[PDB]
Write a protein that binds this ligand. Sequence first.
Ligand SMILES: *[C@@H]1O[C@H](CO)[C@@H](O[C@@H]2O[C@H](CO)[C@@H](O[C@@H]3O[C@H](CO[C@H]4O[C@H](CO)[C@@H](O)[C@H](O[C@H]5O[C@H](CO)[C@@H](O)[C@H](O)[C@@H]5O[C@H]5O[C@H](CO)[C@@H](O)[C@H](O)[C@@H]5O)[C@@H]4O)[C@@H](O)[C@H](O[C@H]4O[C@H](CO)[C@@H](O)[C@H](O)[C@@H]4O)[C@@H]3O)[C@H](O)[C@H]2NC(C)=O)[C@H](O)[C@H]1NC(C)=O
Ligand SMILES: *[C@@H]1O[C@H](CO)[C@@H](O[C@@H]2O[C@H](CO)[C@@H](O[C@@H]3O[C@H](CO)[C@@H](O)[C@H](O)[C@@H]3O)[C@H](O)[C@H]2NC(C)=O)[C@H](O)[C@H]1NC(C)=O
Ligand SMILES: *[C@@H]1O[C@H](CO)[C@@H](O[C@@H]2O[C@H](CO)[C@@H](O)[C@H](O)[C@H]2NC(C)=O)[C@H](O)[C@H]1NC(C)=O
Ligand SMILES: *[C@@H]1O[C@H](CO)[C@@H](O[C@@H]2O[C@H](CO)[C@@H](O)[C@H](O)[C@H]2NC(C)=O)[C@H](O)[C@H]1NC(C)=O
Ligand SMILES: *[C@@H]1O[C@H](CO)[C@@H](O[C@@H]2O[C@H](CO)[C@@H](O)[C@H](O)[C@H]2NC(C)=O)[C@H](O)[C@H]1NC(C)=O
Ligand SMILES: *[C@@H]1O[C@H](CO)[C@@H](O[C@@H]2O[C@H](CO)[C@@H](O)[C@H](O)[C@H]2NC(C)=O)[C@H](O)[C@H]1NC(C)=O
Ligand SMILES: *[C@@H]1O[C@H](CO)[C@@H](O)[C@H](O)[C@H]1NC(C)=O
Lengths: 369, 372
Amino acid sequence: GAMPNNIQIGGLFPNQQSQEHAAFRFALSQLTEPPKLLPQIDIVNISDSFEMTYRFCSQFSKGVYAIFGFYERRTVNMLTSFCGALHVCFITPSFPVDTSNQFVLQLRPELQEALISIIDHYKWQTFVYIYDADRGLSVLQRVLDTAAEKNWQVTAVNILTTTEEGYRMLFQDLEKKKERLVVVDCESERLNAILGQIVKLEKNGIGYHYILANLGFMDIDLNKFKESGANVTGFQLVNYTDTIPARIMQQWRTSDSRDKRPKYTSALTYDGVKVMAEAFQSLRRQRIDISRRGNAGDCLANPAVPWGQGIDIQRALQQVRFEGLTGNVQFNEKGRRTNYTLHVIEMKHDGIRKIGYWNEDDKFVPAAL
Amino acid sequence: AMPNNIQIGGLFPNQQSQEHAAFRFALSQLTEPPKLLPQIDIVNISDSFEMTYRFCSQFSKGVYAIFGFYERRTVNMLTSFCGALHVCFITPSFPVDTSNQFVLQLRPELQEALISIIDHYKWQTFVYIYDADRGLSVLQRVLDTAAEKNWQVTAVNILTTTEEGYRMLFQDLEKKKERLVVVDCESERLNAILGQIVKLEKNGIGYHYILANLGFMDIDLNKFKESGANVTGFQLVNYTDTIPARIMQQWRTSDSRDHTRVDWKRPKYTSALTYDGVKVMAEAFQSLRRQRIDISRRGNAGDCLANPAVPWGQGIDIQRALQQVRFEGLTGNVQFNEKGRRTNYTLHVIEMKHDGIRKIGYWNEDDKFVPA
Ligand SMILES: *[C@@H]1O[C@H](CO)[C@@H](O[C@@H]2O[C@H](CO)[C@@H](O[C@@H]3O[C@H](CO[C@H]4O[C@H](CO)[C@@H](O)[C@H](O[C@H]5O[C@H](CO)[C@@H](O)[C@H](O)[C@@H]5O[C@H]5O[C@H](CO)[C@@H](O)[C@H](O)[C@@H]5O)[C@@H]4O)[C@@H](O)[C@H](O[C@H]4O[C@H](CO)[C@@H](O)[C@H](O)[C@@H]4O)[C@@H]3O)[C@H](O)[C@H]2NC(C)=O)[C@H](O)[C@H]1NC(C)=O
Ligand SMILES: *[C@@H]1O[C@H](CO)[C@@H](O[C@@H]2O[C@H](CO)[C@@H](O[C@@H]3O[C@H](CO)[C@@H](O)[C@H](O)[C@@H]3O)[C@H](O)[C@H]2NC(C)=O)[C@H](O)[C@H]1NC(C)=O
Ligand SMILES: *[C@@H]1O[C@H](CO)[C@@H](O[C@@H]2O[C@H](CO)[C@@H](O)[C@H](O)[C@H]2NC(C)=O)[C@H](O)[C@H]1NC(C)=O
Ligand SMILES: *[C@@H]1O[C@H](CO)[C@@H](O[C@@H]2O[C@H](CO)[C@@H](O)[C@H](O)[C@H]2NC(C)=O)[C@H](O)[C@H]1NC(C)=O
Ligand SMILES: *[C@@H]1O[C@H](CO)[C@@H](O[C@@H]2O[C@H](CO)[C@@H](O)[C@H](O)[C@H]2NC(C)=O)[C@H](O)[C@H]1NC(C)=O
Ligand SMILES: *[C@@H]1O[C@H](CO)[C@@H](O[C@@H]2O[C@H](CO)[C@@H](O)[C@H](O)[C@H]2NC(C)=O)[C@H](O)[C@H]1NC(C)=O
Ligand SMILES: *[C@@H]1O[C@H](CO)[C@@H](O)[C@H](O)[C@H]1NC(C)=O
């Protein structure tokens, strides 16, 4: 049969004032085709499993059809388990983890392979790897595995445990090598501070090279770092001057002016809304009969009784394919971004320039220049 | 005052195990009121949803504490539910460093000791073999010390490594003839992993294996002792020390004429921790009762989830009583810091050479490691 004209969508957000939140509202306002996505977002501590659970169960008993929100490390397991038990989908731009089930739709592309490619490309054989551990440890594992495989000499520093002396200690046996190579793997909000810290710790007469293992390159203090002559390479998800993103920034620009550069997490929040819209428009027109109980269907039971039409909504969300702010948006059957392109940017000589791009199939292709 | 019966919830992975039998045995030994009344539910301890259903269900029916096991996927959920509602979870599961006062880890930390031992042996470069399934706490710790002491660690997840992949890092090593390996794996796989690992050594070279985990004593000592393998590990229970010996005695002599029993040869360390775990609860509750600090709670559904979470009022009293417990158990001196970790305990280091199984020395928080 049919679906209602409104589709209630749950939200798990860390706060109601943020640029991701603005991206969310503005993208919802761009939708014209039915059914209408009716957001019902809650402000929640995304690090606390208890609070997230209360919200998720609260959202579920209420009959929302999917949940868009963010998840932290401590809560990733709880969210994956609850989605899998209830067949309720979670759409998120948060750092992708390993071993989600198929009901978690990850807007954010995995970086680990791209990172490996860029390291091989530069022919790095030994390097320092810096990690904070609050956004997953998969990348480090992937780095250590390839290192063992390729006989690379990797030194690992989790910044949180290292006050100032640790960084200085790495060069105790580092003369006769005129170029030190460093991978920085940390949360985006924190990238600028760590970069600033480790550049201060630099020694004279050694050449320093940095590769950013996380998106977040362009959302940093670029002028300070380029003007300092820093060598830095990172990934960029959004071409802000390509045809479709330029158009989008256009309307967004006009929208703000009556009532500046979006971060990659904002851009994914905006595509995440289109993912939901595409899925629910697609069920509506496909004539797939969906109903959901306003009833307080209790979230907790043994065994968990899955929403029976949930698998239908999971399939629609997974098969979506379109051109968004972050280029081609598409998922494999496990709910990860697939068939995406990453722009590789190299900041060098007081200049930042695109040096190529990376995708799963072609890996990395150098630009003409 | 105090109820004559104190309902304790349990979260157990299995119907039948040595740990469950140790749990039961230890309960039967208690004679002082109040009665500890177990209400355990068999549950998938990897699934956060099942665990949440059981935690909430037990909290609603009025348990005073929960004794149970958790896995890498559920440690965050339990810590969070314990912290928000102020019910204590007492557990021998692999301990963590982001817990809270409401989670009593009967199991002692090993990560600092492991490093110490790696020092007394003076290893500067080595392979670290680890188990992704169970956590990366120890690996991170070692990697950081590698950093600050120029150790050159090659880390290898057993669950991505092939037979050839493993020998690869080696067939290409040739300066010192010794290849030093740290094995950090789930205690159940330890026997196998050591088995798969031993054949995979190119024949003509020497070795040294250090185990990052407890489980050493429960392995096939015979193949390695016979082999002349060099294995070093930890021991937490001395079965020949006075209090443990007597505890074994009582346990063997009851299961002697009991006509339907099994589960007694030499106890796994998890069973020992489970036995001490119960004594922790007993000591805390008998102590609460003899102090006239009252308690009680209503059976009530819908109770569990709220925003904000409404913690149990007397929860903190029970947590404090459980945390200040102290005594000689199967696993030595049982005592907790305010973070809920085992404290003031000693680890014994054991060495396998020729036909020698020997204590090399011991470890603690202030002396680090002292040779014997
Ligand atoms: C770190 O971890 C360690 C363990 O590794 C902890 O050390 C333990 O701490 C506990 C708790 O404090 C200790 O138990 C208490 O011990 C005191 C001290 O005296 C004891 O030990 C010696 C032997 O080593 C004996 O002298 C004592 O035994 C005599 O008295 C008892 C009655 O108290 C009686 O049963 C015996 O017959 C015995 O008499 C003989 O000796 C006396 C004196 O020399 C002599 O006059 C007589 O003629 C006989 O020869 C005694 O056991 C003890 O007083 C405490 O008893 C009091 O409190 C307890 C409550 O627990 C009650 O049971 C009791 O009625 C008393 O009120 C405790 O037994 C434990 O010994 C100790 N273990 C070790 C190995 O040293 C550390 O505390 C931890 N460190 C930190 C910082 O936390
Ligand atoms: C959201 O919920 C999380 C998880 O439940 C809360 O985390 C807890 O918060 C406090 C303060 O941030 C942490 O304490 C700090 O721990 C360090 C490290 O041991 C300690 O040295 C500091 O003194 C400090 O007390 C606590 O460990 C942490 N619990 C965790 C991470 O499991 C958090 O409070 C909530 N966040 C917000 C913004 O309300
Ligand atoms: C950025 O990269 C350049 C080029 O690799 C680094 O320049 C090298 O620096 C060392 C030590 O000062 C010289 O001896 C090399 O011969 C330089 N090579 C070239 C080609 O210029 C430079 O130091 C790096 N920038 C920073 C800030 O570390
Ligand atoms: C990966 O994404 C690309 C880029 O969007 C897809 O290319 C499109 O292919 C469809 C159907 O074959 C055409 O209608 C479009 O004209 C193509 N668009 C662009 C921009 O090239 C490609 O099909 C996808 N590949 C896979 C394997 O799914
Ligand atoms: C207990 O729950 C866990 C996690 O919720 C289940 O784990 C899944 O197991 C399948 C089958 O091996 C794996 O392919 C998935 O990767 C696992 N999911 C996750 C999130 O890890 C597990 O199967 C359950 N165990 C039992 C005995 O039922
Ligand atoms: C256990 O350790 C000993 C010494 O720590 C290893 O002995 C080495 O053996 C190789 C040949 O296998 C010799 O070339 C070395 O010179 C020996 N080293 C020393 C310091 O004596 C022994 O091989 C190890 N056991 C096993 C089973 O590998
Ligand atoms: C932006 O798109 C333009 C097309 O005008 C192209 O030249 C460039 O490769 C893109 N920018 C990045 C950073 O990839």
